[PDB]
Paper text:
Human dipeptidyl peptidase III (hDPP III), also known as enkephalinase B, is a member of the M49 family of zinc dependent metallopeptidases and cleaves dipeptides sequentially from the N-terminus of various bioactive peptide substrates. Crystal structures have so far been determined for DPP III from humans as well as from Saccharomyces cerevisiae. Despite the low sequence identity (36%) shared by the two proteins, both structures are very similar and consist of two lobes separated by a wide cleft. The “upper” lobe is mostly α-helical and contains the zinc binding site as well as the catalytically important residues. In both structures, two histidine residues (His-450 and His-455 in the human enzyme) and a glutamate (Glu-508) coordinate the zinc ion.
Residue numbers in the entry:
A (entry chain A): 2 to 726
B (entry chain B): 1 to 5
The structure:
């Protein structure tokens, strides 16, 4: 068992396998990947600022510490100061946690984690460290500032979120959901994207709140060559509230980023790569999302590159309101062999879309030749590494230019490690099938999730004039039978309208498409299973889905009635949909484990998957798309938040089950990533041990040129914003 | 859109 809000000493650590991918790269491609990786790792540091008030200080402190003394050197100091090996290991694991999450909160669960050792003992180590002897003011200053928050588990600090009972740095501490809604309405009214923005509320002597919308850029208030953004840099009045649009957020960090983007542009393989980089540079320098969208368009047109990459404020999972983006950047190498199955999935893609439970009027008008590749990651900077990505997120680009589907092969391999001892909530005979088919069924689900999942669906949009992108005269809502009553307007996006459930809603729809189309005998041939093998993959994919729905309860907060992770919430919903169908399709039974502790069992009648499960899923999937397409947020919330409701109602009694899920939960593994170094001419790949110490070393060697400078930059930016929290 | 697990 393991306590909430701490990382266990025996937490799994896996090293990313990137040697063979890197070895295939030409000298030019290596220099390209080198600078892009540097750009990504630089930008990843901003996530610390986007996580918690104390995160940038903690990184700065750990960085100083391990720069003067590596894990084996520090051990000799720490053990001489009274720490046991167990206590030192807890600190190593904590440091690795902060590094891998770019913050002292889990990227997967948004929960705080603290060092599993006495604070006073850790103080002796830090204050007596070699880093402390060399820079006593800096180290004591850092410890004084972030020491308490490093350990504090006060209830309001335990989870990320808006309001008084949660921590967020996307907003000032005094901001609530009301403030976010107001800010979003303002942003939409000015056609300004929330992706690269943060919101700060300050009051005067009269208590009247003033709002600051701050954009992320190198440039500040000073005049620049750009006019599209600088013209927005002014004061506004919106529904009685003062609004000021500023920029300069993470400026010296983004300055490092564009330096490496510029250097990468010297090694671009084609004009599409050169142009997309110049636009990203414009985006990060000026604070223009329009510039980033232009870059994304050029990126989509760069088909099948050897070195694939993307960077910026992309995903909006961590923003409590759900519109602001967290910085991420990745560099990956194309895997020709593993891209085969996904490219033939493209061949039958347009056909399979017609098998989806909604009319073609609710589907994209012009079908675009989709891009689906399997890649090997060299760098994935930010709060975490996904198994697959579907990008860009700009919906207008999605329905005019296209989008890229990416499966991260060497990331998937890390997830393909599950001992049958850890396979909880399954009877014996189901475990065997699970081990055999979890791998292939994932490729199926991920494939459909990406291409036909996120890639399907049309948004009904009315422009500035009364013209629609759909035939409002003949298009009929299949659920109501009436003509289309609601749609998206100018300035409105998926995130802007559905806000807090936008991410989870869409992941649920995507997962449903995958689960739904996994019953198709033809899709089980593109991946090539064909027989009972194909049938087995079906059952396992459905058994894994309903098991994950139970496991999802770890990421629900009863006191706040709040889901903390979009994908897990999505999988719980699907469990609820299948449970709603009744007729003995899926049952959850509270049992007792061999260790005498509370347990549970998930039973799935495989015979009733097609007769009961599919019709229930088909109906659910249809309702999801209709409400999404029509932008029916009220209906969308009523449906989704209804299934996402967690109660101790019989017979399932989920609240009771949750306590069992927490009891037997398994901590997600930490992933160590390699480094690339320049030997003047040649680029070398540096690899590290699959351990906490190894992960620490990988970051210790990650910024050889300007490590101490980044420490000071993060400290400076944090201190400037200290009043907000 | 990212895909975890
Ligand atoms: K979102
Ligand atoms: Mg808060
Ligand atoms: Mg992480
Ligand atoms: Zn997804």
């Amino acid at each position: 068992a393991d306590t909430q809000y701490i990382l266990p000493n025996d937490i799994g650590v896996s090293s990313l396998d990137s040697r063979e991918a890197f070895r295939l790269l030409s000298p030019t491609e290596r220099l390209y990947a080198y600078h892009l990786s540097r750009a990504a790792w630089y930008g990843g540091l901003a996530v610390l600022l986007q996580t918690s008030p104390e995160a940038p200080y903690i990184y700065a402190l750990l960085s100083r510490l391990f720069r003067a003394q590596d894990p084996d050197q520090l051990r000799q100091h720490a053990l001489a100061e009274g720490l046991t090996e167990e206590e030192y290991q807890a600190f190593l694991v904590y440091a690795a946690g902060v590094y891998s999450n770019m913050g002292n909160y889990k990227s997967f669960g948004d929960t705080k984690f603290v060092p599993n050792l006495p604070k006073e003992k850790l103080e002796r180590v830090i204050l007596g460290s070699e880093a402390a002897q060399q820079h006593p003011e800096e180290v004591r200053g850092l410890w004084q500032t972030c020491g308490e928050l490093m350990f504090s588990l006060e209830p309001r600090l335990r989870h990320l979120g808006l309001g008084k009972e949660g921590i967020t740095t996307y907003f000032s501490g005094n901001c609530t959901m009301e403030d976010a809604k107001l800010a979003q309405d303002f942003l939409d009214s000015q056609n300004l994207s929330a992706y690269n923005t943060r919101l700060f509320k300050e009051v005067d002597g009269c208590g009247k709140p003033y709002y600051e919308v701050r954009l992320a850029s190198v440039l500040g208030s000073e005049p620049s060559l750009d006019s599209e953004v600088t013209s927005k840099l002014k004061s506004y009045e919106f529904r009685g509230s003062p609004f000021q649009v500023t920029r300069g957020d993470y400026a010296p960090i983004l300055q490092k980023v564009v330096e490496q983007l510029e250097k990468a542009k010297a090694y671009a393989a084609n004009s599409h790569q050169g142009q997309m980089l110049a636009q990203y540079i414009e985006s990060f320098t000026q604070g223009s999302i329009e510039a980033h969208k232009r870059g994304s368009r050029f990126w989509i047109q760069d088909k099948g590159p050897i070195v694939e990459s993307y960077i910026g404020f992309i995903e909006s999972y961590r923003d409590p309101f759900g519109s602001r983006g967290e910085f991420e950047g990745f560099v990956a190498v194309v895997n020709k062999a593993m891209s085969a199955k996904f490219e033939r999935l493209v061949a039958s893609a347009e056909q399979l879309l017609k098998e989806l439970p909604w009319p073609p009027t609710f589907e994209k008008d012009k079908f675009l030749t989709p891009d689906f590749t399997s890649l090997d990651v060299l760098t994935f900077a930010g709060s975490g590494i996904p198994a697959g990505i579907n990008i860009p997120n700009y919906d207008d680009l999605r329905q005019t230019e296209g989008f890229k589907n990416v499966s991260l092969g060497n990331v998937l391999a890390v997830a393909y490690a599950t001992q049958r001892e850890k396979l909880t909530f399954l009877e014996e005979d189901d475990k065997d099938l699970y081990i055999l088919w979890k791998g292939p069924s994932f490729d199926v689900q991920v494939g459909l999730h990406a291409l036909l999942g996120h890639g399907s669906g049309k948004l009904f949009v009315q422009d500035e004039k009364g013209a629609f992108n759909f035939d409002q005269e003949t298009v009929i809502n299949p659920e109501t039978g009436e003509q289309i009553q609601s749609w998206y307007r100018c300035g409105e996006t998926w995130d802007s309208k559905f806000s807090t459930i936008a991410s989870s809603y869409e992941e649920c729809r995507a997962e449903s498409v995958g689960l739904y189309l996994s019953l198709h005998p033809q899709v089980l041939e593109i991946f090539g299973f064909e027989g009972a093998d194909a049938e087995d993959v079906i059952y396992v994919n459905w058994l894994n889905m309903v098991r994950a729905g139970l496991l999802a309860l770890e990421f629900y907060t009863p006191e706040a009635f709040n889901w903390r992770q979009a994908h897990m919430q999505a999988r719980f919903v699907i469990l609820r949909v299948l449970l709603e169908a009744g007729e003995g399709l899926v049952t959850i039974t509270p049992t007792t484990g061999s260790d005498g502790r509370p347990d549970a069992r998930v039973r799935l009648d495989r015979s009733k998957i097609r007769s009961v499960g599919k019709p229930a899923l088909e109906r659910f999937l249809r309702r999801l798309q209709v409400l999404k397409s029509t932008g029916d947020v009220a209906g969308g919330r009523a449906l989704y938040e209804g299934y996402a409701t967690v109660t101790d109602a019989p017979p399932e009694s989920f609240l009771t089950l949750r306590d069992t899920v927490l009891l037997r939960k398994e901590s997600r593994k930490l992933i160590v990533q390699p480094n690339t170094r320049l030997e003047g001419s040649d680029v070398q790949l540096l690899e590290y041990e699959a351990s906490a110490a190894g992960l620490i070393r990988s970051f210790s060697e990650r910024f050889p040129e300007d490590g101490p400078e980044l420490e000071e930059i993060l400290t400076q930016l944090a201190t400037a914003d200290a009043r907000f929290w | 859109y990212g895909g975890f697990l």
